Amino acid sequence: MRECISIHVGQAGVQIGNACWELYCLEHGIQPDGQMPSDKTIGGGDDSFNTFFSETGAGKHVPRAVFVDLEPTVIDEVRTGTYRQLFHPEQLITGKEDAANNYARGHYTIGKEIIDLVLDRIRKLADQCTGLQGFLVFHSFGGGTGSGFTSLLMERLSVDYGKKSKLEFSIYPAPQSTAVVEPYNSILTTHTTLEHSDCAFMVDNEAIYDICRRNLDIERPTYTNLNRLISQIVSSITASLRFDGALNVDLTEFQTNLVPYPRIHFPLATYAPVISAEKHEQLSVAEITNACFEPANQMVKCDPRHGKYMACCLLYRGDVVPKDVNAAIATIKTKRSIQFVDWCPTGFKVGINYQPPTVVPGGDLAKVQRAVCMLSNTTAIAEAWARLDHKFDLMYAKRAFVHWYVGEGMEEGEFSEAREDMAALEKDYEEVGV
Template sequence: MRECISIHVGQAGVQIGNACWELYCLEHGIQPDGQMPSDKTIGGGDDSFNTFFSETGAGKHVPRAVFVDLEPTVIDEVRTGTYRQLFHPEQLITGKEDAANNYARGHYTIGKEIIDLVLDRIRKLADQCTGLQGFLVSTAVVEPYNSILTTHTTLEHSDCAFMVDNEAIYDICRRNLDIERPTYTNLNRLISQIVSSITASLRFDGALNVDLTEFQTNLVPYPRIHFPLATYAPVISAEKAYHEQLS
């Protein structure tokens, strides 16, 4: 198998992760409690979606994901939300105080206290994989300073980074989806559609971009210039979609 482990960091990362896993479950017919009525073979791990879900002996599908935040409120929403039974409690990791969007607090001081625990949980997830192909990290950079400070880390340690601009997504929500005042929920749902489309080739049978190294080969011209721009069309509201022919 070619498994992917998703790591969702911080408030935005966790909320985008929430939207993504909700969508993955809908796409694969997995219920909020992790059961999959259409999958009759319990423990049969040869399906393509097993790159993102691991199946337990009881036939429950558990996301290969870790949610990390330095303060508990956002992950508590996952713990009490609709999909609370989907995630293993050990996959939801919280600290006591947040970094207040301060890069140094997140990277050097408070982040350091929690990093060993996070690595241990990721190691456990990696142990369950037969052929781990890589990690998908969802996070957000709020302040301009932070984005400059994190550029070095992103250049050195990640192989491919898809950038998303909040302002552009606000515009899409207003212009294409007719939402007067878009909320972060609207933004995250749209981002999850994009992430789902990018990862669809990993989760369903197909010939192109079957694993993460192929993404790198097909999309990255030079190792340090690994910031492809994701474009998505058509973006259309549910009401209009019923009445338009989309070819």
């Protein structure tokens, strides 16, 4: 089998991790005390969903997950909540002084003081794996911990876990809220992580916020609303990894056929349907597939119509038959104009995970019998980087706030090195749109 360690870094990472593991538990029939009455083997279970949960001798199913924060506040809520008994206490690791929205504090001065404990706990976790396939890293781009400590951790993982795949669910900053220096942390973390990451799924908080207001009629979405929606998307991506099926596409096949090219490893995710519980008829495979190409359902504000596709993967779940997907894909090719690059292989990769989408009780989403998540490697994603780079440029040209970083163990030349790398990444996207 193929185990996967989830690492949740900083407030955004930890709070998203709470939403994911709450959903994984519901999807798999695991109670908050870790007991799965369903599991036939008590020393194991059905060793397919065992990719994400190890199994105690008592019959306790424990997430193969690490939660890390520089301040204790967030993780103290996990330690005293409904799932206080789901995770091991040593999998919840917290410092006392957070990074104060400063990449340099997360990566150098404060982050150093916790990194060795985190790696020891990952080395312990890895020991309980039959064959670790890799890591799933959840973190914000804007925070000092999410940016600095994630980069530091990714660098250290590469020494003795290099051969393992590393995928990151990253929260792209949006001011509607933002710390003024988030563009700095965002560019800094993207530059340092780029060479040690296999694929990075960005989730623009403004896009998720707007879907909540428009699709779920939530006047003032909280991070809970946002995280519940994000976790539904995360679940669809990882379902192939947690569920046994003939039509489910394995990590190796998906990462290779979506990000085969090294630096340009940022796919756009689109999820459908997003329906309010307040409402409801049944959406067909063709209807949910059509919705994948509407910009309203995108996780990052962008226009794939303005760019070229390098790869496209469709991850269905629920009452979905292959022949109905083939018919729906054929239809959209005759209406929509999905332009692929002139050197890339054209075609869609399709994965069908049989268990339909589960909704958290009380959550604003309706229960649907079929859902899809489209992952498309489009050059349009350069628009999102251009936005971040521009805000970085405005502040850096006047050296605004730079002193906070240079006083916390970081060299000023690292700003220009990170920015030049982003400018090269922007040029890479222009070069493939040939």
